[PDB]
């Protein structure tokens, strides 16, 4: 949106039930998580991708 014209709220109110994709936040799916229950309890694990 152009901030000089409209606010964020007024812009979203034209279609508040619209969805956008997000590749900046992804969802990794490995068999270890589903089958190894030790990886379903990770909490803020410092890892590199």
């Amino acid at each position: 949106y152009n901030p000089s014209t409209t606010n964020a709220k007024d812009f979203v109110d034209g279609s508040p039930s619209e969805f956008l994709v997000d590749e900046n936040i992804v969802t990794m799916h490995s068999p270890d998580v589903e089958f190894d229950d030790r990886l379903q309890n990770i909490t803020n694990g410092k890892f590199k991708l």
């Binding site: 709220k9 007024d10 109110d13 034209g14």
Partner: protein, 49 residues
């Protein structure tokens, strides 16, 4: 709700609010039973030790 802006109108409830009877356009279009509330309120809640 003028243009779909229901978020801004929700935000500015302190200003954009008035009773039904005081709406000068609705002095004869609304029945006396559809502008005054005359039913109880059910107060029910529990607490902890």
């Amino acid at each position: 709700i003028t243009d779909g802006k229901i978020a801004d109108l929700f935000n500015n409830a302190i200003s954009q609010t008035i009773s039904v009877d005081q709406v000068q356009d609705w002095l004869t279009r609304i029945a006396d039973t559809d502008k005054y509330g005359t039913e109880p309120v059910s107060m029910k809640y529990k607490s902890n030790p």
